[PDB]
PDB file of N, CA and C in Angstrom:
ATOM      1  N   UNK A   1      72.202 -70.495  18.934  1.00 31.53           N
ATOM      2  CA  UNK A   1      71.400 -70.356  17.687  1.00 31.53           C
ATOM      3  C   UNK A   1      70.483 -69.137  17.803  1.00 31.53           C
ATOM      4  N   UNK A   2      69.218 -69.048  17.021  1.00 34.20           N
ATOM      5  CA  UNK A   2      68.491 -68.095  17.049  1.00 34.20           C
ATOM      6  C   UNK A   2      67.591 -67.956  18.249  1.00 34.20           C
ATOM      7  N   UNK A   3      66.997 -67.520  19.555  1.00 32.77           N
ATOM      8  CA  UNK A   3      66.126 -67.310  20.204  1.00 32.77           C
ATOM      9  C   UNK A   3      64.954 -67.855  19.886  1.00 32.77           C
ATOM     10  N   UNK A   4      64.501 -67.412  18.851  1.00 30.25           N
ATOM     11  CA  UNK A   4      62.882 -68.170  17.994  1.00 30.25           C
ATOM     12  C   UNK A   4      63.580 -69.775  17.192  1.00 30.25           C
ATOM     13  N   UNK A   5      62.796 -69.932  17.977  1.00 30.46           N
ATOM     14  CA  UNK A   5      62.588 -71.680  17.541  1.00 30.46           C
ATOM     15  C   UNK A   5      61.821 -71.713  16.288  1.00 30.46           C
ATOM     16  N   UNK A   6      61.575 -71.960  14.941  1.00 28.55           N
ATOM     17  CA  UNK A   6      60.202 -72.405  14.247  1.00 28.55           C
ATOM     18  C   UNK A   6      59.900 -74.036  13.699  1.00 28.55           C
ATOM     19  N   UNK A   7      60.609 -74.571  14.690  1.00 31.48           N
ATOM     20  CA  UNK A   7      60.397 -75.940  14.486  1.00 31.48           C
ATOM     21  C   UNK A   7      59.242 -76.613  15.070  1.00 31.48           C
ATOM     22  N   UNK A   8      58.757 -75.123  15.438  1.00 30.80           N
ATOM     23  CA  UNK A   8      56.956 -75.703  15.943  1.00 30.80           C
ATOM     24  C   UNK A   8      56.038 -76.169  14.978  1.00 30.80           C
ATOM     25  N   UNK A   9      54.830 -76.672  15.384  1.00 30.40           N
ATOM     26  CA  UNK A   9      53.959 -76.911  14.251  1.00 30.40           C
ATOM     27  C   UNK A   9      52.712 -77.198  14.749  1.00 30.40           C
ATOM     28  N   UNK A  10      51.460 -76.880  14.335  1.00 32.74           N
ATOM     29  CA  UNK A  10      50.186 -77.219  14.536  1.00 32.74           C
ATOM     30  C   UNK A  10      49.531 -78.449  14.156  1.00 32.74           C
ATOM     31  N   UNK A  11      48.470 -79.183  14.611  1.00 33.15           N
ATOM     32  CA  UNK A  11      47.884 -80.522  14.008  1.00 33.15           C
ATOM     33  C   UNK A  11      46.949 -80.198  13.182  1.00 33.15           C
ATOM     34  N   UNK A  12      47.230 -80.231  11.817  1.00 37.03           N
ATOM     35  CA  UNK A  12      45.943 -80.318  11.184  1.00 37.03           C
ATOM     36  C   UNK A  12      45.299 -81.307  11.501  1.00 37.03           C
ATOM     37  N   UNK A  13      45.104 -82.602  11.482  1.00 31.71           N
ATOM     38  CA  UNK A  13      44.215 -83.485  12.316  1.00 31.71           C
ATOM     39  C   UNK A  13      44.646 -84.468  12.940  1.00 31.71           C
ATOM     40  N   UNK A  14      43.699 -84.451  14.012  1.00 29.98           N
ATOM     41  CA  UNK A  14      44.470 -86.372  14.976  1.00 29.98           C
ATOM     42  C   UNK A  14      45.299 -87.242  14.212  1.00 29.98           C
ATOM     43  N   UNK A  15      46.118 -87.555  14.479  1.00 31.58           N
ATOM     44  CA  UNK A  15      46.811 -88.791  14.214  1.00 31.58           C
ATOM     45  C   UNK A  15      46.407 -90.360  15.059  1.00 31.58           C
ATOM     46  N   UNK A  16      46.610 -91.749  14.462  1.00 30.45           N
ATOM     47  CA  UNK A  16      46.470 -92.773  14.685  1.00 30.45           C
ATOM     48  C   UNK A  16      47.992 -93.491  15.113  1.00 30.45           C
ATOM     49  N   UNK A  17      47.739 -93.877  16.224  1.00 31.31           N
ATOM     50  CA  UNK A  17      49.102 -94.508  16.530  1.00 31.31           C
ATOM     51  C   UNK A  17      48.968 -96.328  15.868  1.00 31.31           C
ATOM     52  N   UNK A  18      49.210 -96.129  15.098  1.00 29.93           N
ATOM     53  CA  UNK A  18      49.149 -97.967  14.533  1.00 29.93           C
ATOM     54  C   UNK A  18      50.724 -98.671  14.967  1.00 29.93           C
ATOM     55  N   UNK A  19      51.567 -97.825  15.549  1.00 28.87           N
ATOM     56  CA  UNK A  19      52.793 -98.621  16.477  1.00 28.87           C
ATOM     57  C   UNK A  19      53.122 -98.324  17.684  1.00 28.87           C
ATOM     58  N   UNK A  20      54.085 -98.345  18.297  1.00 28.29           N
ATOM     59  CA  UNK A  20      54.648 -98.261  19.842  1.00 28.29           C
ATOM     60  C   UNK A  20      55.871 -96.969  19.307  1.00 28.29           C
ATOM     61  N   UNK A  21      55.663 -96.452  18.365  1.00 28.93           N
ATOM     62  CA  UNK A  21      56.430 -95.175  18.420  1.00 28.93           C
ATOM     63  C   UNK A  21      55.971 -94.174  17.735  1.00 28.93           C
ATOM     64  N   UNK A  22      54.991 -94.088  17.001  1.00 31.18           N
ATOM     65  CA  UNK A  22      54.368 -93.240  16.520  1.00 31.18           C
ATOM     66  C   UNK A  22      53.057 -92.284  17.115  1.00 31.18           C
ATOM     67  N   UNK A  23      52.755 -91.550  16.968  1.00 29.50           N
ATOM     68  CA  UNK A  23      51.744 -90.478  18.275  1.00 29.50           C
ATOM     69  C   UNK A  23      50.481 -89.560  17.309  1.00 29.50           C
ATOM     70  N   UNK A  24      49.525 -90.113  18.132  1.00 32.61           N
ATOM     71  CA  UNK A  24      48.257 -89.986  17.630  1.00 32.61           C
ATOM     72  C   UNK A  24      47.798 -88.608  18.085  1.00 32.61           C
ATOM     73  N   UNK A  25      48.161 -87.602  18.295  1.00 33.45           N
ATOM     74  CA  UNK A  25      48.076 -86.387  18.254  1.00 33.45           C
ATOM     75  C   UNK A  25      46.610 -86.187  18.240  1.00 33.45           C
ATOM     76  N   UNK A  26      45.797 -84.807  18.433  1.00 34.29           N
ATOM     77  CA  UNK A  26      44.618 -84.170  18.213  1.00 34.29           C
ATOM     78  C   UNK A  26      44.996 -82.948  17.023  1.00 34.29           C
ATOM     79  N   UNK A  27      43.112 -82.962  16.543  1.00 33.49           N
ATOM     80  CA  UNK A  27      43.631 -82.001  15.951  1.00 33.49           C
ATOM     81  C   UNK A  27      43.691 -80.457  16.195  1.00 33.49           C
ATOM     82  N   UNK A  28      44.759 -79.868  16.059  1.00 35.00           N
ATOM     83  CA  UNK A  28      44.990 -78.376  16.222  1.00 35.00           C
ATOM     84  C   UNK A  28      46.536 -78.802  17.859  1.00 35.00           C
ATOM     85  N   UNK A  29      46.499 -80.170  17.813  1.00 32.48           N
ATOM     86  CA  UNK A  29      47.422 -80.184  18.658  1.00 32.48           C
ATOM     87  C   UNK A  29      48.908 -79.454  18.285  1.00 32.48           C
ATOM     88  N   UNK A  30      49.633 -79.293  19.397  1.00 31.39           N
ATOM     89  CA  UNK A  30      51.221 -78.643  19.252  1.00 31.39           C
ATOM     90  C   UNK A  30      51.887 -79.671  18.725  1.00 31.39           C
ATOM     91  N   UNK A  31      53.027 -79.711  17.807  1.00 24.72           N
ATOM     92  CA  UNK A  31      53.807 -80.980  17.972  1.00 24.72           C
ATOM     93  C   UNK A  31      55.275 -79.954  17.610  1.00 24.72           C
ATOM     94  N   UNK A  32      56.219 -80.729  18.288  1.00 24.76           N
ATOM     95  CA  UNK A  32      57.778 -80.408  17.672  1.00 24.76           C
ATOM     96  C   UNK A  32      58.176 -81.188  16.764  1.00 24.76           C
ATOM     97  N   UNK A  33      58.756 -80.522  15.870  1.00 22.97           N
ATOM     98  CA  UNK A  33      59.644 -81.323  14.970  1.00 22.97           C
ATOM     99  C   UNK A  33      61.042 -81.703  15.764  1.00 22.97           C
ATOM    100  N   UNK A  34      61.239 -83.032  15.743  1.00 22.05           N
ATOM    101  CA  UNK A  34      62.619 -83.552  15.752  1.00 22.05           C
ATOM    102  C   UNK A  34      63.754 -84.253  14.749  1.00 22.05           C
ATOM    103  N   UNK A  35      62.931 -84.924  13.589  1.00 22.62           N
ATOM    104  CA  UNK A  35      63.567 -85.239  12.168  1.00 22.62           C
ATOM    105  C   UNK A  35      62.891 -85.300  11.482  1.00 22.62           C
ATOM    106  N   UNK A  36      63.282 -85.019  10.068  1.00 21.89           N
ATOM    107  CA  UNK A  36      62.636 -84.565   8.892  1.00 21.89           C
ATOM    108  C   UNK A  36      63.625 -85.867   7.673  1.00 21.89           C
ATOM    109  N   UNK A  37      63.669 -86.971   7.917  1.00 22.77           N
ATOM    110  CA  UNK A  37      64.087 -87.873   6.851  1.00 22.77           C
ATOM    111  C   UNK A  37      62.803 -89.021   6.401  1.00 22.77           C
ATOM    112  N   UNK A  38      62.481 -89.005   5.460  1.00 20.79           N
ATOM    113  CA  UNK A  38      61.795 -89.865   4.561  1.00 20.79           C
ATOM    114  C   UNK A  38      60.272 -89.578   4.535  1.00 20.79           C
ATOM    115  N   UNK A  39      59.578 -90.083   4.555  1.00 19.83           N
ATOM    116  CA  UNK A  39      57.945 -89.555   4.539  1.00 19.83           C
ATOM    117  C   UNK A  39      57.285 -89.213   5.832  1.00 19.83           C
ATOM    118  N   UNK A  40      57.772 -89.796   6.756  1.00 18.77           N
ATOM    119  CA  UNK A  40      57.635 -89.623   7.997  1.00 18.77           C
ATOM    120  C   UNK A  40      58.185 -89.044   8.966  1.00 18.77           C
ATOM    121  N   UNK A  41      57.936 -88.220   9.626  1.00 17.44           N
ATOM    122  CA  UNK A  41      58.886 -87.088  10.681  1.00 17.44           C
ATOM    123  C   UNK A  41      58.613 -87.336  11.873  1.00 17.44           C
ATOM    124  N   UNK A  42      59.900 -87.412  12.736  1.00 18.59           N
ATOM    125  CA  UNK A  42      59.280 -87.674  14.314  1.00 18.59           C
ATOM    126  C   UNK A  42      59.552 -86.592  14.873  1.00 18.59           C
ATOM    127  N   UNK A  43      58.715 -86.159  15.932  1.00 20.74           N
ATOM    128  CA  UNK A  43      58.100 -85.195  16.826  1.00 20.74           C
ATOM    129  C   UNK A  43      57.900 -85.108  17.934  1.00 20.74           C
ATOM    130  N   UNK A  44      57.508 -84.082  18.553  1.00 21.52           N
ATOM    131  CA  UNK A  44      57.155 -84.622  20.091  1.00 21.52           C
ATOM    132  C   UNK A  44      55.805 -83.410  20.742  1.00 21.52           C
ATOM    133  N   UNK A  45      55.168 -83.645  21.419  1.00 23.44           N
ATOM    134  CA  UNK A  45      54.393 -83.187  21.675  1.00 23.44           C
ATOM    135  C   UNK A  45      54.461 -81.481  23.145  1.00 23.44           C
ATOM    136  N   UNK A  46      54.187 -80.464  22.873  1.00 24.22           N
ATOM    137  CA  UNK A  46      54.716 -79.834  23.880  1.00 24.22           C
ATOM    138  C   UNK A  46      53.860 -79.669  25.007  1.00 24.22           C
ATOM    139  N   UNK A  47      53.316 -79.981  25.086  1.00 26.00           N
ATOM    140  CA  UNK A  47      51.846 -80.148  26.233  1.00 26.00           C
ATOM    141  C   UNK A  47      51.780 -81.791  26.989  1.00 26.00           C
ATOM    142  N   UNK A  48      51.910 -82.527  26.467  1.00 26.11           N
ATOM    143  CA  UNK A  48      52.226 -83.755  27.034  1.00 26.11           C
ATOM    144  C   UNK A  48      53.502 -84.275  26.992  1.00 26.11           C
ATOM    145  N   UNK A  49      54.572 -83.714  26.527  1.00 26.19           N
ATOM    146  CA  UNK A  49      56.090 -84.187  26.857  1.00 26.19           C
ATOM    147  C   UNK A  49      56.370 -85.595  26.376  1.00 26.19           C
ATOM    148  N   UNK A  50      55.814 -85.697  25.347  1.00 26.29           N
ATOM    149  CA  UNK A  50      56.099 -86.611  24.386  1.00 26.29           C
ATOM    150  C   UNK A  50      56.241 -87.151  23.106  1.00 26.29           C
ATOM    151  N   UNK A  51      57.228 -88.063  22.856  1.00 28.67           N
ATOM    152  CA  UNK A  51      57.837 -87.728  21.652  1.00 28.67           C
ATOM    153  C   UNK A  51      57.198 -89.204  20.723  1.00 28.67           C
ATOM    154  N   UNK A  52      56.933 -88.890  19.137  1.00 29.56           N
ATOM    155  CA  UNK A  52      56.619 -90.360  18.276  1.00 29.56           C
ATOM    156  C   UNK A  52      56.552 -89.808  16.799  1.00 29.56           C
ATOM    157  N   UNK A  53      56.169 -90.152  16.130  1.00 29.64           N
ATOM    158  CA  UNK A  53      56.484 -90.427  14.505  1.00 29.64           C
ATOM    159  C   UNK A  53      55.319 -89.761  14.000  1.00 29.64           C
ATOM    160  N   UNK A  54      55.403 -88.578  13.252  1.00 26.94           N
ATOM    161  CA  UNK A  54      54.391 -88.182  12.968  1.00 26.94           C
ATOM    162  C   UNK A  54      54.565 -87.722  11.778  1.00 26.94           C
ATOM    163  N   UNK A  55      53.165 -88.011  10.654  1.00 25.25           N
ATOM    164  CA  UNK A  55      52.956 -87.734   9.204  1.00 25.25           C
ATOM    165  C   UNK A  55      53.599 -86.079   8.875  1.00 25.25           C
ATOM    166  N   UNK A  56      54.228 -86.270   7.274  1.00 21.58           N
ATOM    167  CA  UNK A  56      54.267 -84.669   7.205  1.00 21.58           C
ATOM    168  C   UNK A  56      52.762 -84.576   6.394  1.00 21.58           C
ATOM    169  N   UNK A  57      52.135 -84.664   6.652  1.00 21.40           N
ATOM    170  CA  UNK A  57      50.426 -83.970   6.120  1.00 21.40           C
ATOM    171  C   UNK A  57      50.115 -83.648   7.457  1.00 21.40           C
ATOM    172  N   UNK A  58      49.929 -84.357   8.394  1.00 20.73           N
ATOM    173  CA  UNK A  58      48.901 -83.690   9.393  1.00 20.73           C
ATOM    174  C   UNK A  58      49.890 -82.252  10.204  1.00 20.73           C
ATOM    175  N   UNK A  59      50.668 -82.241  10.011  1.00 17.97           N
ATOM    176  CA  UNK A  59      51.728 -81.254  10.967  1.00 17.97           C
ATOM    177  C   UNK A  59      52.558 -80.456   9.701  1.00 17.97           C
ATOM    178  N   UNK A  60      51.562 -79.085   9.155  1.00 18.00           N
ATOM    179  CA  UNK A  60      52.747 -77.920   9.010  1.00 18.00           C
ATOM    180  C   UNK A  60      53.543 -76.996   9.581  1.00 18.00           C
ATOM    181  N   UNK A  61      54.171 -76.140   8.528  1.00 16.17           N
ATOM    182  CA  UNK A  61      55.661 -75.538   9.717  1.00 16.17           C
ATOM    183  C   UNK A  61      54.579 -74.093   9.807  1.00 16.17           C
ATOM    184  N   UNK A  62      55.026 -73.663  10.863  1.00 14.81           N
ATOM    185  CA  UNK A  62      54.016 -72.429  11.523  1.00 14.81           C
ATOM    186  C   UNK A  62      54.388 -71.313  10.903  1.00 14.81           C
ATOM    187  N   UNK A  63      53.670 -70.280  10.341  1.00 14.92           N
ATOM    188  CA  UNK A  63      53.881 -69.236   9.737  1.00 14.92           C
ATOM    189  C   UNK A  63      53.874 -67.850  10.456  1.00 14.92           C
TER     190      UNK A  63
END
């Protein structure tokens, strides 16, 4: 594929983990996108190597 990845994304603010798969992030944290189906997108974190369910409000695509 392409060399540049832009499936990165920044935290606009902390996230709340209210399950066992979703990830409460900081804000201005890194997150990856991994799927983009329904209101909710799961992700993963690149600094802590971990992956959970994260809002599309708090995490836009990097410009």
């Amino acid at each position: 594929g392409s060399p540049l990845q832009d499936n990165l994304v920044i935290a606009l603010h902390s996230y709340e983990p209210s399950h066992d798969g979703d990830l409460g992030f900081e804000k201005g944290e890194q997150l990856r996108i991994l799927e983009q189906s329904g209101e909710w997108w799961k992700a993963q974190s690149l600094t802590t190597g971990q992956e959970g369910f994260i809002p599309f409000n708090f995490v836009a695509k990097a410009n």
